[PDB]
């Protein structure tokens, strides 16, 4: 046997952040050395290893993270890092171990008119806990008075539209990420 | 009512420190993305500092360090503290509410800093 | 991402249709907001996400643009209507305004 890494890297469509995917692996060796140069990759930074030795090793279970974000935001997707993404999206531990994987799609996430399938959650009153997922679209509370679900001033919808045009500048454009930990 | 009234601004040497207050109405500050803006004299508006909800802060890179931006849930009130003080920080300090793909709807008056020795 | 503003000063008397132009480095689509500020007062948010009209804004203020050109349009100035107008990037971590257009009284 060998391990499946076709799977969560050429999937035909991609998760929204908020409702990140995680896919499981209980397998044999896995070719990272050979994912390194598998194709081109805008980025490609582990947090645990040198990548040359991750093919000499073998591990208890391992996860792969897949969504979609904006450029500017990929560098939220490492530990110690705040912000609109990892605050409230997608947050990773401080003594997160592995690696981070990620490459521009402004050919298949957007669209002519903008492709608005993918969404990001702007507000929330408290930080992710690393690995969290909260998908709730419950209308989110800015003020003293309360919402009771009905969207109006200081009652906001919590989830936001990605614009992808692909007229956008390289940081407003979509980056697919995987992330794989140990 | 909805406002954002400020406090705090005036005269000050260089080096210098002050705290400005945003005393909320209407919108509770621990809830939101606030931020706080100035506009040097005869210039525009410039970003200072920003704090989200779940408490992350972020700075304008002419400021890190000196500045710190801080709230109190209990008095619903936002504050900038500026530390070692400097002449190009002579402005009008704003204080607004930030509705990221919603605009900036709610401003303070405005409060006046003014560094000088 | 940085903002500039076509009309530094732009002139226009009671009655006319007057037009600023934001244009953005890169291309933000449909990512902008509009402000208007008098002398000594506060911003007051006029356009948000390029073209919807933020409450209670007088409906002559309109807002086109995407990409990476928009433009700000009263369609019959008033005398309330003189004063400087300022766009901004719609952001949370830095922001960015523009410069400014004022528009004067026309002679």
């Known amino acids: 046997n060998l391990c499946p890494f076709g799977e969560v890297f050429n999937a035909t469509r991609f998760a929204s952040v908020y409702a990140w995917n995680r896919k499981r692996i209980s397998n044999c060796v896995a070719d990272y050395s050979v994912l390194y140069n598998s194709a081109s990759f805008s980025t490609f930074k582990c947090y645990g290893v040198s990548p040359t030795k991750l093919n000499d090793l073998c591990f208890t279970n391992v996860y792969a993270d897949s969504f979609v974000i904006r450029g500017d935001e990929v560098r939220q997707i490492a530990p110690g890092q705040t912000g609109k993404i990892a605050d409230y999206n997608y947050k990773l531990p401080d003594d997160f171990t592995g690696c981070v994987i990620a490459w521009n799609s402004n050919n298949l996430d957007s669209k002519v008119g903008g492709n608005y399938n993918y969404l990001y959650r702007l507000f929330r009153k408290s930080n992710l806990k690393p690995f969290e997922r909260d998908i709730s679209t419950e209308i989110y509370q800015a003020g003293s008075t309360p919402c009771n679900g009905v969207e109006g001033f200081n009652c906001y919808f919590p989830l936001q539209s990605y614009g992808f045009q692909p007229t956008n500048g390289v940081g407003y454009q979509p980056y697919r990420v995987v992330v794989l930990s140990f | 009512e909805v406002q954002l009234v400020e406090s705090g601004g005036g005269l000050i040497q260089p080096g210098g420190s002050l705290r400005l207050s945003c005393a909320a109405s209407?919108?509770?500050?621990?809830?939101?993305?606030m931020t706080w803006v100035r506009q040097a004299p005869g210039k525009g508006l410039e970003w200072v500092s920003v704090?989200?909800?779940?408490?992350?802060?972020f700075y304008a890179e002419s400021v890190k360090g000196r500045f710190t931006i801080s709230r109190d849930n209990s008095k619903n009130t936002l504050y900038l503290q500026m530390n070692s003080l400097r002449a190009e920080d002579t402005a009008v300090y704003y204080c607004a509410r930030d509705l990221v793909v919603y605009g900036m709807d709610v401003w303070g008056q405005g409060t006046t800093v003014i560094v000088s020795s | 991402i940085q903002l500039t503003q076509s009309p530094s000063f732009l002139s226009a008397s009671v009655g006319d249709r007057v037009t600023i132009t934001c244009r953005a480095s890169?291309?933000?689509?449909?990512?902008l907001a509009w402000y208007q500020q008098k002398p000594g007062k506060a911003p007051k948010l006029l356009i948000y996400?390029?073209?919807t009209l933020q409450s209670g804004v007088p409906s002559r203020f309109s807002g086109s643009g995407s990409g990476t050109e928009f433009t700000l349009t009263i369609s019959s100035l008033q005398p309330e209507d003189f004063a400087t107008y300022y766009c901004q990037q719609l952001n949370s971590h830095p922001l960015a305004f523009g410069p400014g257009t004022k528009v004067d009284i026309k002679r």
């Open positions: 996400a390029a073209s």
């Open positions: 704090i989200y909800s779940g408490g992350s802060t």
């Open positions: 890169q291309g933000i689509s449909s990512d």
């Open positions: 209407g919108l509770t500050v621990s809830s939101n993305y």
